[PDB]
Write an enzyme that holds these catalytic residues in place. Structure first.
Site, PDB file in Angstrom:
ATOM      1  N   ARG A 246      -0.608   9.308   0.100  1.00  0.00           N
ATOM      2  CA  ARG A 246      -0.011  10.651   0.278  1.00  0.00           C
ATOM      3  C   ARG A 246       0.911  10.610   1.503  1.00  0.00           C
ATOM      4  N   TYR A 247       0.503   9.857   2.523  1.00  0.00           N
ATOM      5  CA  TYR A 247       0.934  10.033   3.926  1.00  0.00           C
ATOM      6  C   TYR A 247       1.585   8.751   4.484  1.00  0.00           C
ATOM      7  CZ  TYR A 247      -1.576  14.472   3.781  1.00  0.00           C
ATOM      8  OH  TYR A 247      -1.969  15.744   3.478  1.00  0.00           O
ATOM      9  N   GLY A 248       1.829   7.761   3.631  1.00  0.00           N
ATOM     10  CA  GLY A 248       2.894   6.778   3.851  1.00  0.00           C
ATOM     11  C   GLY A 248       2.720   5.528   3.015  1.00  0.00           C
ATOM     12  N   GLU A 249       3.283   4.438   3.514  1.00  0.00           N
ATOM     13  CA  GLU A 249       3.373   3.134   2.811  1.00  0.00           C
ATOM     14  C   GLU A 249       3.119   2.025   3.815  1.00  0.00           C
ATOM     15  OE1 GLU A 249       7.361   2.868   1.104  1.00  0.00           O
ATOM     16  OE2 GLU A 249       6.865   4.392  -0.399  1.00  0.00           O
TER      17      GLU A 249
ATOM     18  N   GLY B 239       0.836  -1.208   0.000  1.00  0.00           N
ATOM     19  CA  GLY B 239       0.000   0.000   0.000  1.00  0.00           C
ATOM     20  C   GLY B 239       0.860   1.242   0.000  1.00  0.00           C
ATOM     21  N   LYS B 240       0.430   2.277  -0.723  1.00  0.00           N
ATOM     22  CA  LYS B 240       1.123   3.586  -0.753  1.00  0.00           C
ATOM     23  C   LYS B 240       0.046   4.656  -0.894  1.00  0.00           C
TER      24      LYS B 240
ATOM     25  N   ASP C 245     -12.671   7.419  10.812  1.00  0.00           N
ATOM     26  CA  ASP C 245     -12.324   7.273   9.378  1.00  0.00           C
ATOM     27  C   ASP C 245     -12.677   5.872   8.889  1.00  0.00           C
ATOM     28  OD1 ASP C 245     -11.529   8.129   6.828  1.00  0.00           O
ATOM     29  OD2 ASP C 245      -9.398   7.870   7.251  1.00  0.00           O
TER      30      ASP C 245
END
Ligand SMILES: COc1cc(-c2cncc(-c3ccc(C4CCN(C)CC4)cc3)c2C)cc(OC)c1OC
Ligand SMILES: COc1cc(-c2cncc(-c3ccc(C4CCN(C)CC4)cc3)c2C)cc(OC)c1OC
Ligand SMILES: COc1cc(-c2cncc(-c3ccc(C4CCN(C)CC4)cc3)c2C)cc(OC)c1OC
Length: 284
Positions: free
Chosen positions: A18-21, A15-16, A134
């Site tokens: 805006r705000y990490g991996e 997974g990747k 979220d």
């Protein structure tokens, strides 16, 4: 006295954003999932770490915590969250690859409701009540046993903004009572109802299924703005479509009623996670 094995081999990026991996990793021959934060979303690592420092959540439908790691680098701080690894991936991913039967649909949605009710409940002697803030199909993982687990407590509150497509009307119109913990549970229930709609579409009945679509696919663009969502949800009061074919199937007829009772404009009219669980145990 003792060796503390901390090496994790990062094997593949799964997974990747805006705000990490997220990486599949190996520790002592065992798969783990490693979320590497961007410095721009450091507060999500801090919030999830502060929550787990407060209460060590352990529930079959909550992504299993293993570790929070901060490592000093020459001119930066590296932040990792290490959890159990679910090789089937996210529910969002899964619903594009498969259709569901009645048992598998109910098992998915009751497991999500179970995790959510566990977050929401205050237990004395125990855990504080927790709202997720979220909830969405990308933040739910599929386990090999057919149940799911809820991930990402980076926005959670105990007693960054949420994904706009899944925001409740009181978030979009800024009427939410921000001093009232129950407000945040009711925002999660709205989002749960959307997830229930996403999953139910992929349940076959009478040889029919809907294609996977995200909530509001038909009325907002990709990466919808706050205003796009406010006009749909608040001003026009639109809700996701219930297809006619659901009304030929007793399971989907019951799920349609449940998702309606998660989508009331009035937040206090919405079902609680515990009432959703009870309803789902009486379906089929
Ligand atoms: C620091 O960092 C990481 C550590 C580990 C890890 C590796 N071996 C052993 C341990 C261990 C656990 C628990 C005790 C207890 C024993 C009973 N006694 C009464 C209190 C202490 C000791 C040792 C740990 C925690 C893994 C990591 O990654 C998976 C770490 O990095 C995040
Ligand atoms: C962080 O995560 C993992 C950690 C470990 C691990 C490594 N060394 C030691 C331990 C340990 C031993 C003993 C106690 C004590 C606590 C009090 N009292 C005395 C009874 C028992 C606690 C902790 C653990 C739990 C293994 C893991 O997997 C096999 C972990 O998962 C990735
Ligand atoms: C949502 O949030 C978090 C999720 C996870 C997490 C845990 N298990 C498995 C996964 C995963 C594995 C594999 C695939 C795909 C990729 C390749 N293929 C085409 C199908 C399979 C997708 C997803 C993830 C992403 C960990 C997290 O933290 C460490 C998360 O953040 C809290």
């Amino acid at each position: 006295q003792r060796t503390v094995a901390r090496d994790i081999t990062l094997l593949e990026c799964v997974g990747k954003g805006r705000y990490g991996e997220v990486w599949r990793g190996s520790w002592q021959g065992e798969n783990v999932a490693v979320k590497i934060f961007s410095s721009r979303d450091e507060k999500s690592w801090f919030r999830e770490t502060e929550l787990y420092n407060t209460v060590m959540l352990r529930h079959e439908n909550i992504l299993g915590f293993i570790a929070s790691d901060m490592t000093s680098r020459h001119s930066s701080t590296q932040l990792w969250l290490i959890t159990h690894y679910h090789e089937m991936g996210s529910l969002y991913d899964y619903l594009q690859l498969t259709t569901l039967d009645t048992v598998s649909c109910l098992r998915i949605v009751l497991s999500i409701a179970s995790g959510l009710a566990h977050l929401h409940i205050e237990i004395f002697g125990g855990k504080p009540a927790i709202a997720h803030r979220d909830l969405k199909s990308k933040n739910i993982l599929v386990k090999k046993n057919g149940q799911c687990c809820i991930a990402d407590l980076g926005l959670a509150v105990m007693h960054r903004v949420g994904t706009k497509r899944y925001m409740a009307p009181e978030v979009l119109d800024e009427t939410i009572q921000v001093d009232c913990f129950d407000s945040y549970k009711r925002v999660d229930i709205w989002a749960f109802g959307l997830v229930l709609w996403e999953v139910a579409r992929r349940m076959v009945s009478n040889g029919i299924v809907e294609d996977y679509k995200p909530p509001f696919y038909d009325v907002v663009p990709n990466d919808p703005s706050f205003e796009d969502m406010r006009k749909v949800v608040c001003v026009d009061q639109q809700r996701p479509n219930i297809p006619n074919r659901w009304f030929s199937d007793p399971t989907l007829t019951s799920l349609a009623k449940l998702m309606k009772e998660c989508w009331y404009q009035n937040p206090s009219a919405r079902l609680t996670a515990l009432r959703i669980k009870k309803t789902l145990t009486k379906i089929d």
